Design a protein around this ligand. Structure first.
Ligand SMILES: NC(=O)C1=CN([C@@H]2O[C@H](COP(=O)(O)OP(=O)(O)OC[C@H]3O[C@@H](n4cnc5c(N)ncnc54)[C@H](O)[C@@H]3O)[C@@H](O)[C@H]2O)C=CC1
Ligand SMILES: NC(=O)C1=CN([C@@H]2O[C@H](COP(=O)(O)OP(=O)(O)OC[C@H]3O[C@@H](n4cnc5c(N)ncnc54)[C@H](O)[C@@H]3O)[C@@H](O)[C@H]2O)C=CC1
Ligand SMILES: NC(=O)C1=CN([C@@H]2O[C@H](COP(=O)(O)OP(=O)(O)OC[C@H]3O[C@@H](n4cnc5c(N)ncnc54)[C@H](O)[C@@H]3O)[C@@H](O)[C@H]2O)C=CC1
Ligand SMILES: NC(=O)C1=CN([C@@H]2O[C@H](COP(=O)(O)OP(=O)(O)OC[C@H]3O[C@@H](n4cnc5c(N)ncnc54)[C@H](O)[C@@H]3O)[C@@H](O)[C@H]2O)C=CC1
Lengths: 267, 267, 267, 267
């Protein structure tokens, strides 16, 4: 097992097609003992996570709640047992109000909406790291989920801005995490058909947005020298596991592209 | 005159060592007619700008004020005369509460403070562009001021995060600005001794921050193959002018490094 | 005149649709006095350059010839007059044998052919700089022509490899050029319909290569927020002039994208 | 075993402090069956490789020899047995004549010397891939060794140019390798004290070169948020193994930084 005996917190499970669902699944298949956090529908998350190959305690964490964050390390050492520490943290959390993404014009997202999106999608990566670094082992590993924001793209709008901020946060958390013997890195995934992503191709955020996102995915798979299957999250899940393992021991403040090699190719 | 007959709005003058002061000065030396915006001490800004080689109307603009932004294009066409449009916009605005920069630990900046900094330093670049694109000529040019955030650095902390968000905003404003025949670009400047920067090397934000910033500047000048003079803002001012001119007509969504070539060199 | 009184060597004119032809034209329109170099058909180059707005001495330079390079600065100070120096050098030279570009498979280009291409397209940028730096003024400027090699693309093959090597050479020539007070930079141009580029879209190097190159150009213009006109080299010519001028005084070891902003956009 | 049952060719062992030595060692500790190639002193390489935890056939390969390359896949299937294929190729080969690296001035390396260096250090990555792709399994993995050439640095000179060319080659080999179901990637290592690197810090290539290289290493370890130990190649070896495994299944045409996170930090 790649992850044998490691104890690892995985956030971000909301449905069984959440990228964090598959990260959890692969991590357990690989020997890891998990603690899970979930945001707002804990009954639902409890029922989805019943499906994982092994039981895992589930704690509530709303990344905008000072109090949840303040108590987090206590609730975790409670769940894993006093004198035990975390080897791994997975941040797989993201959100942008719909005004920052539609065919809703880029200049019309108001700042309260984008600030909410950056709070949850970028800043929260530092918050998690602050709450959890005190309970991590030397040799530990924090991983977040990224979508390559280095060129602008249609429809993603402020969510791309949010990702740009995240990558920058990640280089700072790596500075802090290093004092603990801990790595911090991002996985830049190719587009994956979550519920939300399907809703958007189906037009939930405007028809032209849906059309641009559909073209985005097809181009991705054409460029990728090994192809990209948007319906299969397990290559991303394996990549997060690769970072949680002892096999990337000199990589930090960094970004690993789990995207079919698409970003390396112009067409 | 590089900028002959162009009409250009320059924001961000607060003292005579503001990078926007010198941008204004060089632009006027080069034939430009200016409109100036200023934030909170308009009496002071009025008195500093008296020093520019030519008179220029001064309008108040607090980039966090919906109302100032809503009225901005009216106040400007008023100042430049109905049926006249802007050829140029300079965004030279930046701020981060001191909790997001000290030896104040990176994980301790609260989100309200960083959100304030991102509002003013990143989001405001889109706001300015939204208010002003309706009154710009085809062939126009929007320029903002950047500090290369692509690697983390000591002390700059959340301000670097704010710059990462800005560069991403800039690639989106370029999408919008293109519909108007307008370029949008950033100038990534080397460190320049503003009042604030001096205050920090003098220790205003903690002694170790001051020491890291001093080391930052010295390394910069050593790497720069043509050297870097932190006391001279005029090479940056000329670069902003180069972008405001007709001489970079195919560059947009882009970043021009006015930094002595330092970012191209490891040591 | 942007370039008034500057003396500037422009290499690379072969026909009237050479990017160096237009660089020469715009530079002369802008006040520059030129010296021209040309490679193998000097009678032809003489006749094409008769068309420039002003006369210019023409010297022969085969960048693979040790002797031409050894004598170059002598022939130039002869043409510009003893005690006069160059303010500007334009390198607009490139070549790759057809085995390194066809539908000719990437793995089949033999090393002698690629070495020839790298010699002329990458190494020669250092050679020119070595021959000419002794006769350049402080404040001078060397500019080469680049095609963004940072992602692989169909058909360009080893020429992209050659461009990657060039950009790296450029960061080193900037180290040397700095000792003389001289900037060194690259202009990354969008695709431009030279004779050769037309020959390729017409299928000179295989039908699928021609088809991939045609798709390359169309994507370019779609992404570019201000569009890209492959038939108009004058926006690139103006950009080279912007670098030859005093208006980018703190940029070196660098790359300026004259590409419609296409590289900043994913789609 | 991370690499259980995989068959893997590792080139580049010359002494027991070769990065390929440790790659071989870790790969064998991890279940891999190896075939080894070696360049010019095969008796010596035979004796060094006796030290590996398991026996491995050793074949001669001079990457500049057309004939060695032409016969390579035959000699390998001979060594691994007909109907068996390679899962892994490690390219850990590099060389630049000393004229392209000293305090020997950058402009004085003659083209024959740099062409030799690029042949062996960059082009040879495509040659290996051409010889070996016919004998690789779907799901296979080719890995080369890189030193981040994205900024110029003292003393490395033309070897940095050679690395820039390599990274570009790698993005093309990924295009070819994809048709076979095969990944191609580079590991960008921090500086490691091979014999050669020690010789250089000891001044073999000039005193100021030695001094710049010493400063290079110290800066590296200061920037690296998790530090860098130049005497320990095993974190790099583990990284190459991470790429040879099934745990990075969606990464190709890419670069993984095994460098302590140093490239993500300015100071
Ligand atoms: N789906 C795609 O094509 C790609 C997604 N990503 C990133 O993957 C990560 C996971 O998203 P997906 O699995 O795709 O969608 P998802 O919707 O399954 O996951 C998003 C998670 O964020 C959690 N969340 C939202 N607000 C929260 C808050 N205040 N506190 C705590 N948690 C909160 C949600 O409960 C949900 O579990 C996100 O960062 C996303 O940006 C990266 C690349 C591609
Ligand atoms: N000084 C340095 O070493 C470098 C500075 N920069 C950037 O240059 C730009 C200008 O800053 P400097 O001239 O260095 O300092 P400065 O303090 O002279 O300029 C900052 C300007 O931001 C304006 N501002 C702050 N909040 C505002 C608000 N709510 N509305 C409108 N304006 C507001 C201030 O009034 C001031 O005029 C900033 O974006 C800065 O980040 C970029 C590279 C280097
Ligand atoms: N055409 C395009 O779409 C783009 C071209 N570029 C670059 O622009 C530069 C100029 O090429 P173009 O004007 O497009 O084509 P061109 O064919 O007009 O110019 C190429 C020049 O290289 C010169 N040359 C070849 N071998 C030489 C040698 N041994 N010594 C001296 N000169 C030699 C040729 O005589 C010719 O004048 C090249 O570096 C090219 O790679 C950059 C971006 C786009
Ligand atoms: N040592 C360092 O600080 C770093 C080295 N690298 C790269 O690691 C790779 C391995 O080099 P090291 O282990 O450091 O040194 P090394 O000297 O142990 O390995 C170099 C290998 O290249 C082989 N070689 C040279 N010419 C050859 C030819 N014609 N045919 C076949 N093989 C040939 C040599 O026999 C030797 O085994 C090289 O690509 C190097 O550039 C990357 C980052 C850092």
């Amino acid at each position: 097992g790649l992850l044998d005996g490691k104890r690892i917190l995985v956030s971000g499970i909301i449905t069984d097609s959440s990228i964090a669902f598959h990260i959890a699944r692969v991590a357990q298949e690989q020997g890891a003992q998990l603690v899970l956090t979930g945001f707002d529908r804990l009954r639902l998350i409890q029922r989805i996570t019943d499906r994982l190959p092994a039981k895992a305690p589930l704690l509530e964490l709303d990344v905008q709640n000072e109090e949840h964050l303040a108590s987090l390390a206590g609730r975790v050492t409670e769940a894993i047992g006093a004198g035990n520490k975390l080897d791994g943290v997975v941040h797989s959390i993201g959100f942008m109000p719909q005004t920052g993404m539609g065919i809703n014009p880029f200049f019309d997202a108001p700042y309260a909406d984008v600030s909410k999106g950056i709070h949850i999608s970028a800043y929260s990566y530092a918050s998690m790291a602050k709450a959890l670094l005190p309970i991590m082992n030397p040799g530990g590993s924090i991983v977040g989920m990224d979508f390559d924001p280095s060129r602008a793209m249609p429809a993603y709008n402020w969510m791309t801005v949010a990702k740009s901020a995240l990558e920058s946060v990640n280089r700072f958390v790596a500075r802090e995490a290093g004092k603990y013997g801990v790595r911090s890195n991002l996985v830049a995934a190719g587009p994956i058909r979550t519920l939300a992503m399907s809703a958007i191709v189906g037009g939930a955020l405007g028809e032209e947005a849906g059309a641009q996102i559909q073209l985005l995915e097809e181009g991705w798979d054409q460029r990728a020298p090994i192809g990209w299957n948007m319906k299969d999250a397990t290559p991303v899940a394996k990549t997060v596991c690769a970072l949680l393992s002892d096999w990337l021991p000199a990589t930090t403040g960094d970004i690993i592209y789990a995207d079919g090699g698409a970003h390396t190719q112009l067409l």
